[PDB]
């Protein structure tokens, strides 16, 4: 039972950047493949970014591609998210997750995912 806390989120401007950081506790960060998704106000968990178990593979959203950037560090058991040239229209909850298959190394669906974070509130003012 990994455990997983999401922080570094915040109110900013556009055009600024952000770094967000999931924190994972219990397990080691290693056995995971992991995975930022975002919920915007009246929509689904929309996926934005993954990193497999290797940090080999590192997937991206088409919205967010060339902006963000996912990122593991061993040390401090942590996945982060950076987010430059942030909108308006990236204001959301932003989660991280776990692949709860070692089947899928890449996966889009928020049903391939679990032991969800608690979120970290990022908004973007004009």
């Known amino acids: 039972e990994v455990q997983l806390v999401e922080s570094g989120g915040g109110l900013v401007q556009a055009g600024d950047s952000l770094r967000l950081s999931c924190t994972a506790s219990?397990?080691?960060?290693?056995?995971?493949?992991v995975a930022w998704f975002r919920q915007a106000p009246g929509k689904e968990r929309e996926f934005v970014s993954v990193?497999?178990?290797?940090?080999?593979?590192?997937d991206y959203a088409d919205s967010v591609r060339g902006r963000f950037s996912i990122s593991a560090d061993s040390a401090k058991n942590t996945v982060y998210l950076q987010m430059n040239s942030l909108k308006p229209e990236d204001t959301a909850v932003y989660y991280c997750?776990?692949?709860?298959?070692?089947?899928?190394?890449?996966?889009?669906?928020?049903?391939?995912?679990?032991?969800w974070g608690q979120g970290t509130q990022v908004t973007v003012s004009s």
């Open positions: 997750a776990v692949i709860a298959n070692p089947v899928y190394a890449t996966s889009r669906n928020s049903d391939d995912y679990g032991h």
């Open positions: 990193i497999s178990r290797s940090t080999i593979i590192t």
């Open positions: 219990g397990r080691t960060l290693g056995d995971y493949g």
